[PDB]
Design a protein around this ligand. Structure first.
Ligand SMILES: *[C@@H]1O[C@H](CO)[C@@H](O[C@@H]2O[C@H](CO)[C@@H](O)[C@H](O)[C@H]2NC(C)=O)[C@H](O)[C@H]1NC(C)=O
Ligand SMILES: CC(=O)N[C@@H]1[C@@H](O)[C@H](O)[C@@H](CO)O[C@@H]1O
Ligand SMILES: *[C@@H]1O[C@H](CO)[C@@H](O)[C@H](O)[C@H]1NC(C)=O
Lengths: 497, 497
């Protein structure tokens, strides 16, 4: 329907401007006849998910690199893509006037949008909140009667989550992650810094931290929202580092293991939410395969765990083979899921860089790499932030895909947003990654998956400056002749039958 | 040269039998000397455009009826006259022996015939086809790889058009019209029934439908044929009716308006055929002025519409003033044009009355009405039918100026043929209707036009049983004393210098 309204801010590309009466959107998707492919392009130079089409001819006039689809080579199945509804995000969003709010949600969740089917939901305050609270801050309340939900959950997170699910293309799943417990179960009695839970797994401190997990669940359920999964903690490696500034609860791998085993798992198991899946190690990729080795090799924990959740900090190198690769090898039946990613901390980079293509590229390179190493789903950090890059009670240190300019009632869509969309919109839940063979060495990143209905989808990223001539072969349909422009991103689709 | 060979089938008048060795034909056209007028005469009693000549008098003594030419009451200029090359027609025409054919084509297109200067051409199958087909029946071919012309076009319609042009000496203009789009573009997936273009204008369905016109014109260009104009759709209103039996595609006027502005207009504009004119509403009179108001008050639609096309059901009433007149008043610069007419649609009447005089009169009466109300030219329906009024695949049979009996290798020219001829032969493209006031109430239908060379033509029709004596005054030259025999049609021509 409506194209991108560009705006430069002195970066290598532009964002797209939406206010309360215009936003760039998509038409109900079409499915071109067997023999016909669809392409979506976004370029640094300015193009933004633009639909074009062409032939899958059975001749082969292309003499460069070949990408051969190998549909019989079958890999993991996809949970889906989304991002987190942090206090920050909820606040920045409700700054906007209601019509702007809807153009915004639609952008993320609608078919006119990019089809998010996941929302990560922090359990009380995190660094991206305007205050440090938990759901039971009243002291020595061990059976949890003053367990309540603040204005924050009741007015901000929850009604937006409802609206998000109304607009949604597809069914949406919900993920929870606690940052810190009530401070009267902490070795340090403080929402941050080197301070774990009190006593040892099994004891009453440990048993209450588990009941809070259940309570959060009942509480969100009165408002009629069920969770697909919860993480055991967000970033527990962090609570062992003295002077950690954000809300954090320490857990050595050995500690998480025994906690899940004796407390979290059994408590969850015995409750009406026994179907909510538990995820472990909600923390950085360099903590694997070790953390997995420790938690899962003990039978009594492992039987509760459904997946391992990881974090991409896109400012840092971290070899996938040695981390995720090795992790799948050691437990091929244990799913890998990416529960947070963000970029913007390099001290010398503005936290929010409006129209940064490099950052979009970094995003996609990260998701592709993800799926080539067995990952079932990728989840962004904040849905929306301000131009400073907040509101964060400690410091802005990360960008976001949508930035909200409250003073001008407009909001902007970063190259990030579209580099994500090239995946989330075209890989429904149930899709399965399938083989895809390069004919030769190439400066491109590629990935191929297969829709539920059995149609193909291949994302191609170019991070070099040079254009790249490319042929994608599909054994059933024939050859798809194309060029992949420098600094670009294509998502190709087609029927196979 | 050769006169009509008459034969009767028990109706009020005769047909002119023609075969492979004989057909009634005209001498090469001449002009009356200044001071003399020319007459062509057709009568129920058997005279078939008989040529005679007589003097223009200096003075006139009388109390009887007086038609006064008003050379300065200048009105619409004239595009011309012709008829439609439907599959049915081509098929009938092409099933006679070759010399039977040439004679049939010359009957319509030569100077020794009635010199048609328009052929309307259906873009694929109508109800006067023997099979349903589009040019793009492969489903979801949004790119129209498999767009093409089947035999109906390539061995029937085109060859016959080339031959028709060859024989014609006035330049012939072609007009093209689609009944249905491919079925994958339509909401109901059928060639018939309530249905329309999917989605909304500016979308992919609408963009394709547009491209289809251009492909259409591409293909006909490759066979060295250019079209003067196309219609936005044949009988759009019909596509809006539950149960509709034959090829169609339904537009509300808003739909048609928006389609024209957003898709059809631009697409034609950005192509080699931009010169091709575009006519809106290829439907019945009662839709005016409404449809006219809806399309023509939107300037993004108006800039594309070169005129308004109307269908004339002769068995059926419409008030000329409240329809055409009013429309001319609102849009004097959008030409009215008649794209179709037929007799024998109405449920209770026979499709073919061979030799029906009553039918010819119904023709000229209403072609004169057309001219009186700013219609710039006229296009009959099927050039040739069979004695059933077909073939037609929903059995939607109706009459035709020429009826072909293949078992006898013989075709029959009807009163309609000559009734049309009285106009088509004597009103070259560029003629301008002028005023003609009567001196008193009277049973005649008349019309006056001036040719491009400056000389006069007046058609006089008598639908009463009684001879009317009358005089035509033209101040430049004098008086024509004549009689309109009862149940007759006369065409008069004279120089003015
Ligand atoms: C076609 O029509 C012509 C004219 O009607 C027919 O020839 C005439 O009819 C009879 C038969 O010989 C003769 O008395 C006349 O000499 C003919 N008249 C003229 C003007 O030619 C002829 O029979 C028909 N042709 C065919 C092939 O059936
Ligand atoms: C509410 C508002 O100020 N909208 C402006 C509007 O005039 C403009 O045409 C559109 C595209 O830039 O969005 C912006
Ligand atoms: C369309 O046309 C091409 C070339 O003429 C042909 O090889 C192909 O098989 C056709 N496709 C379909 C779907 O009919």
């Amino acid at each position: 329907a409506r194209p991108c309204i560009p705006k430069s801010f002195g970066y290598s590309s532009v964002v797209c401007v939406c206010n309360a009466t215009y936003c760039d959107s998509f038409d109900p998707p079409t499915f071109p006849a067997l023999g016909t492919f669809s392409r979506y392009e976004s370029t640094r130079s300015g193009r933004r998910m633009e639909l074009s089409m062409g032939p899958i001819q059975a001749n082969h006039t292309g003499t460069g690199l070949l990408l051969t689809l190998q549909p019989e080579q079958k890999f993991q199945k996809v949970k889906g893509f989304g991002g987190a509804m942090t206090d920050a995000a909820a606040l920045n969003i409700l700054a906007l006037s209601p019509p702007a709010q809807n153009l915004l949600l639609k952008s993320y969740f609608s078919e006119e949008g990019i089809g998010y089917n996941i929302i990560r939901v922090p359990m009380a305050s995190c660094d991206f909140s305007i205050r440090t609270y938990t759901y039971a801050d009243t002291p020595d309340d061990f059976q949890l009667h003053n367990f309540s939900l603040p204005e924050e959950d009741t007015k901000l997170k929850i009604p937006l989550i409802h609206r998000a699910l109304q607009l949604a293309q597809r069914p949406v799943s919900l993920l929870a992650s606690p940052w810190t417990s009530p401070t009267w179960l902490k070795t340090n009695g403080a929402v941050n810094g080197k301070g774990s839970l009190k006593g040892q797994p099994g004891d009453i401190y440990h048993q209450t931290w588990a009941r809070y997990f259940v309570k959060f669940l009942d509480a969100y359920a009165e408002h009629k929202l069920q969770f697909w999964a919860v993480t055991a903690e967000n970033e527990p490696s962090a609570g062992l580092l003295s002077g950690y500034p954000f809300q954090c609860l320490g857990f050595t791998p050995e500690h998480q293991r025994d906690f899940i085993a004796r407390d979290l798992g059994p408590t969850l198991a015995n409750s009406t939410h026994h179907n909510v899946r538990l995820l472990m190690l909600d923390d950085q990729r360099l903590l694997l395969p070790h953390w997995a080795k420790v938690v899962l090799t003990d039978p009594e924990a492992a039987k509760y765990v459904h997946g391992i959740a990881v974090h991409w900090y896109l400012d840092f190198l971290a070899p996938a083979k040695a981390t995720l690769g090795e992790t799948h090898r050691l437990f091929p039946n244990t799913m890998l899921f990416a529960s947070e990613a963000c970029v913007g901390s390099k001290f010398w980079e503005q936290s929010v860089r409006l129209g940064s293509w490099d950052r979009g590229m970094q995003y996609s390179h990260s998701i592709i790499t993800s799926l080539l190493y067995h990952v079932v789903g990728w989840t962004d950090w904040n849905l929306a932030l301000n131009p400073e890059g907040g509101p964060n009670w400690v410091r802005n240190f990360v960008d976001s895909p949508i930035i909200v300019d409250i003073t001008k009632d407009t909001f902007y869509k970063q190259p990030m947003f579209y580099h994500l969309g090239h995946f989330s919109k075209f890989i429904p839940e149930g899709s399965q990654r399938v083989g895809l063979v390069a004919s030769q060495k190439n400066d491109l990143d590629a990935v191929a998956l297969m829709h539920p209905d059995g149609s193909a989808v291949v994302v191609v990223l170019n991070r070099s400056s040079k254009d790249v001539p490319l042929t994608i072969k599909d054994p059933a349909v024939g050859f798809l002749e194309t060029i992949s422009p420098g600094y670009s991103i294509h998502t190709y689709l087609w029927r196979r039958q």
